[PDB]
Subunit: 292 residues, 4 copies
C-alpha cells in the first residue's frame, strides 16, 4: 500500500478543564505538524497523545479530527493498542474504515502476560481488522521486552509489517535491522535520532517533532548523505531542546511551545498537571534560543 | 457504616469466549467466597478480577452483580482506579450509589506521573465521590513506590482511611503501621499472611482466598493469639497452593479450582489464555492433597 | 560440631586514617558484643566489617583478633568469600586453623557468573578447607539471586550446612525453611527479625546487634514463646534505631554509638567518609531515647 | 604527553590450572593485539583481564609483563581501580613508575557509596600518583550511574582527562561529548562502536578487538570518513562475532579463538569455567566464516 517510511509527529492532544478533547486546537496541532514542521505523517493516539488516559469515544474523536485535518498525501498510523483487546479491535476497525495506512498496538502491559498471550493479541487484532500492523515496543513504560527470537515469531506474520522501536539499546536495534531487512523500523527515541539513522532505520516517530520537525529532517537527511558531523551538531541542538522539555514535563511543555505560535493547545488531561509556571522564563529562553 | 477490617476475597470474574461477563458464574463465585470460604467481604474489580481488561459498563456490571450476590452482613470495597480519572470518578460515584462501603484506587501507572499528580488523583476521586478511599499499592504491576513521607501526605486527608498494601517489604510495612496507628492496613500478599498478621495488619485481601479462605482465617486468628507455629504450618500449606497456581497461571487456575466445585468459572478475558490442560494432573494432585 | 543456631553480631572493624586495623578497638568491639550485648557468637569479616575493602593480611588480622577476644563458649563464623577464589581458600584454611566453627562465603559478584560457576566456587572452598560452609546470600549488594531449586543443589552437598539469609523476600524464606527443614537459616535483615523468627529461622546475624543486641534477643525469644505483641513493639523500637543509623551512614554511625560507650571505635575505611557531625545531635537524641 | 586517542585491546590474561598467570601466553596475547590486530594500545588489568579475580602481586605481574612485551610507541592504560583504595594507589604508583601513560579506575562498587565518596576516591588516587586519570564507567557490572552533573564535577579536575564510557545510553554519551569537548571519550561497547564513532568518541577500548581489531579500525575510520553504510555492515559482521562469543562465555571463548592462532591462551581463572566443548563446532564455524 502507501509507502510508510519517513518522519512522523507523535500527535499531541489539547484538553479542556474537564479532560475533554479540544477539537479545534487538535486540528491546529495536526496542521502544525504537517505544514509547519513539514513532517511526512502523524502517529495518532500513541502515548504522547495521552491516549491511555482517554475513553473509547475520545480516541475515536482524535482519529477523526486528525484524519480530516491533513491532506491525502499524508501518512497516518493509528495506535489502537489497549488493555481491552475488544476495544483495540473496535478502534482498529474504526481507523481502518477512516482510511489509516496501518495500525499500531502497544505490547499488552500491567499484567505479566506470557509472550504467547502477547503474540495472539497482535494476531487477534490483525485477524479482525485485516489491516497492516506495526509493533509498538516501549519497554520503559511497559516493562515488556521483545527478544530477537520473539520478533522472529512475530515478523513471521505477513501483516505485521514493522516495529515502532522505542527502546534505547542499539545492539538490539542493529540485530533487528540485520535479522529483518525487509521490515519497517521506525525509531521512537528523538534524542538518539542520528544514531538510529546510521543504524539503518526507515524513519522515526516522535513527540518533539511537533516543535522540532525540521531539525529532525536535517538530522535524518544529512546522516544518510554522509554529512554526519553536521547531523550530530543538529542532534546536539535538538537534545538541548529535548532535555529541557523533559525537565519541565514533556507533554504540557511541548503544548506550551505550541501555544506560543497561536495554537489553542489547551491543557493536559488529569492527573497530569498543567504547565508549571515556575518553568516559564526558562521555557521562553528556550523558544528564543532555538526559535521554537 | 461498617468498619473495613477482616479478610477479603479479591473477586474473580468468569468470562465467555467473547470476553463478556458471565453473570451467573460471577454470582456463584461471589457466594463461594462468603458461604464456602467464610470470608468477610469482597474486593471487587481489583487486578485479580481482570478489571483492567474491562470496559466501563463491564466494570459497572461486575459491581452490580457482586452487590446483588451478597447479603448486608458482607463488606464491599470498590476498586475504581483507572488511567482515565474521569472513568475513576464515574465508577466511584456509581459504586458509592450502589452502597459499596469504601472505594479503592490503584496508583496511576504506565505514565511516569509525579507524586503530586498521583496525590491529586486520589484527592479528586474523593472530592467527587465523598466516599472513603483506600490506597491500592501494587509496585510489582505499576512500578510505583510510595514512601513513608508520601504516605504521610496521603493519610493527612481524612477520607483516605487506609491502604491495600500489596508490597513485599516488611520494614516499610512496620514503619507504616507505627506511623499511622489508626489507619486501615490490609495486606495483599497471600503468601506472607502470617508475617503481615504479626505486623499488625487489620486484615487482608487476596485472590487465593477464593479457594483457600478457611486456612487464611486460621492463619490470621491463630497468629493473633500467639499460636505461631500452627499458623506458620498453615502458611506452609497455603504457599504450596499459591506456588503451584502461580506456576500454572493464577487467574485461570484459581477459577479451574472453583470449576471443580461445580462453579461456572468460565474463561479468562483475552489476551489471557485459558488454563493449560497440560497442567491438569498437577492441579488435580494439589486439589486432592489440600482438599480444595 | 558447635551448634551454629543463635544470635550473632556482624563484627564492625575500627580503622585509623590510613585504613589500617585498630586491633585494640577491634578487641573492644568483639568483647562488647559478647559481654555487654550478651550475644551467642561473632560473624567475622562480613560486609558490615568493611571486609571487601581490606587486603588479605588485614582479613587475617581481623580473624585473629576476634577469635582471641572471645571465650571458648562463643560461636564463630568466618566470612571468607572473595572474588579471588585462591584468596577465599587461603582465608578458609587460616580461619579453620584458628578454629572457626564454620566458614561463610558471599555469592561471587561483579562478573555475571553462571550458577554453575557460583556452585562450584562453594564446592571448591569446601574441598580445600574441610570445614562447614554457610551460604552468604545478600542480593541487595551482589545483585545475585538464588532460586529455591539452586539452593537444593547447594544444600545437596553435605558440608553446606546453612544460609545467612540477607534478603527481604519472606515467600522465598518460607519455601527454603520448608524444603530444607534440617538446614541452618540465620536471618540477615535486622529490621525484620520478628518476621524472620516466626518464619522459623534458627538465629540471626546483624550489625546493629552490636548496639541493640539485648532488644534483639527479646524479639527472638518473645516471638518463639508466642508473645508476638510485645515482640513486635520491640521491633518498632529497634526499627527506629535501625532507620536512624541507616539515614546517617550505618557503619560510621554504629561505631559512633560504640564510641559513646568508651570503645576506641576508630574510623571507617576510605572511600567511606567519617561520621558527618551534622548528624551528631540527632544521634545523641537516639542514644538517649533508647539508652544505647 | 602521549596522545591517548585511538583503539585499544582490553588485554586478556591466560591462567594455568591453579589460577596463576601464564607469562609466555600473556606476552603472545599482547603481541597479538598490537602487531596482528594492529591496535594503538593496551588497556591492562580491566574487567576483561579478569583483574578483579586477581591478587595484588598478580596485577603487578600483568602490568609488568604487558609493558615489556610491547613497544615504546604502544599506548598503555593501567586500570588500577579497586575496593581497596590503598591497593588502588599502590597499583597506580606501580603502574606510573613502569611508564604507563594513564591510569584508569572503576567506580567503587558492591557497597552503596555516596557520590562524594566516589568522587574523592578518584581525587585521592590522583593525588598519590600524580598521573592522569580515566574514569571507568561500567554500570552493567558496578550498578553505579554517573549523571552529567556528576561528570562535570569530576571533569573539573585537570588530571581527570576523560572517561572509558562503558554504558549503553547514547543520550548521556551525546550530553557528555557536548559538555566536555576537550575531554577524552573512549567507548567500551564493542557492539556499538559505529554509533559511538559518529557520536564523536576519541577512540574505543574492547575485549573483542583482541580477535577483531582490524574490523574495529575500519568501522571507526569509515564512519568518521562519512562512509557510514560500509561502517555499519562491518558492525553487522562484528556483532555476529560479539553475539557468538557472548553466548558461549566471552573471556574463555575469546581466548580459545586466540588458541586457534597458536597462542598459549591458557584457561580462565576460577570461578570462571573453561570453554564448553559443546560450543566447539559453532565456534569453529565462526572462526572460518570471519577468518579469525
Amino acid at each position: 500500500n502507501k509507502d510508510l517510511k519517513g518522519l512522523y509527529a507523535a500527535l499531541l492532544v489539547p484538553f479542556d478543564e474537564n479532560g475533554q478533547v479540544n477539537e479545534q486546537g487538535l486540528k491546529q496541532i495536526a496542521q502544525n505538524a504537517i505544514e509547519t514542521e513539514e513532517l511526512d505523517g502523524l502517529y495518532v493516539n500513541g502515548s504522547s497523545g495521552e491516549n491511555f488516559l482517554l475513553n473509547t469515544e475520545q480516541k475515536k474523536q482524535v482519529f477523526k479530527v486528525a484524519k480530516e485535518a491533513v491532506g491525502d498525501k499524508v501518512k497516518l498510523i493509528a495506535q489502537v493498542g489497549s488493555l481491552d483487546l475488544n476495544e483495540a479491535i473496535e478502534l482498529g476497525k474504526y481507523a481502518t474504515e477512516l482510511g489509516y495506512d496501518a495500525l499500531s498496538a502497544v505490547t499488552p502491559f500491567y499484567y505479566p502476560f506470557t509472550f504467547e498471550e502477547i503474540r495472539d493479541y497482535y494476531f487477534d487484532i490483525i485477524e479482525a481488522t485485516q489491516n497492516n500492523m506495526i509493533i509498538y515496543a516501549i519497554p520503559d513504560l511497559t516493562g515488556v521486552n521483545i527478544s530477537i527470537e520473539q520478533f522472529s515469531e512475530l515478523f513471521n506474520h505477513e501483516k505485521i509489517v514493522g516495529v515502532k522501536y522505542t527502546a534505547p539499546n542499539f545492539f538490539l536495534l542493529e540485530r533487528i535491522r540485520k535479522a529483518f531487512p525487509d521490515k519497517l523500523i521506525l525509531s521512537g527515541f528523538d534524542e538518539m535520532l542520528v544514531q538510529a539513522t546510521i543504524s539503518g532505520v526507515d524513519g522515526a516517530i516522535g513527540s518533539t517533532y511537533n516543535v522540532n520537525g525540521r531539525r529532525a529532517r536535517k538530522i535524518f537527511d544529512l546522516a544518510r548523505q554522509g554529512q554526519i558531523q553536521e547531523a550530530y551538531q543538529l542532534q546536539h541542538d535538538s537534545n538541548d531542546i529535548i532535555e529541557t522539555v523533559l525537565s519541565m514535563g514533556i507533554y504540557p511543555t511541548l503544548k506550551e511551545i505550541l501555544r506560543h505560535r497561536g495554537i489553542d493547545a489547551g491543557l493536559p488531561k488529569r492527573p497530569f498537571k498543567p504547565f508549571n509556571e515556575a518553568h516559564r522564563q526558562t521555557l521562553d529562553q528556550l523558544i528564543a534560543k532555538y526559535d521554537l
